[PDB]
Amino acid sequence: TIAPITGTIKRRVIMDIVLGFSLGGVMASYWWWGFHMDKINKREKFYAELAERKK
Template sequence: MAVAPITGMLRRGLILDLGIGLGLGFALGNAFWYGYHVPRTNKRDNFYKKLEEERAAKLG
């Protein structure tokens, strides 16, 4: 084999690093999605809903 297999401490460190990276990525992704994106989208949708209701009220 040209490259030796990953074993021992290197393997455990690699698994730990991947686990931490994926866990933090998932956590920060959820924080962005539910902490910024969803509230901002709801605010935008409510604005346009109110605007449409006002327009409909003017037309009769």
Template sequence: MASAAVAPAFKPITGMLRRGLILDLSIGLGLGFVFGNAFWYGYHMPRVNARDAHYRKLEEARAARQGN
């Protein structure tokens, strides 16, 4: 029995499909980076700073009560 050359199950990514794939990945990663930074610096960091200020105020009040 002669073995026949087996064709790949799919063709290589070329041309318009390749450009579209690169464009989609670039847009997806870019938007992910932008929205990730918007969340981090627009919501997360202000909440962390507010929390830290609250606990700093409580600690100062506790230290003042103890006379330190």
């Protein structure tokens, strides 16, 4: 007999979309972590090979 109803109009879609956005962002960050490690490793290798032969 809880009088306050009609509160389920919008919070469902809001929680759904916010959870989806959070899941997408966290999966993107997890994927990009290793790719960024690879990118920085390759950049370090490029700098090392570019500077090591000159000196």
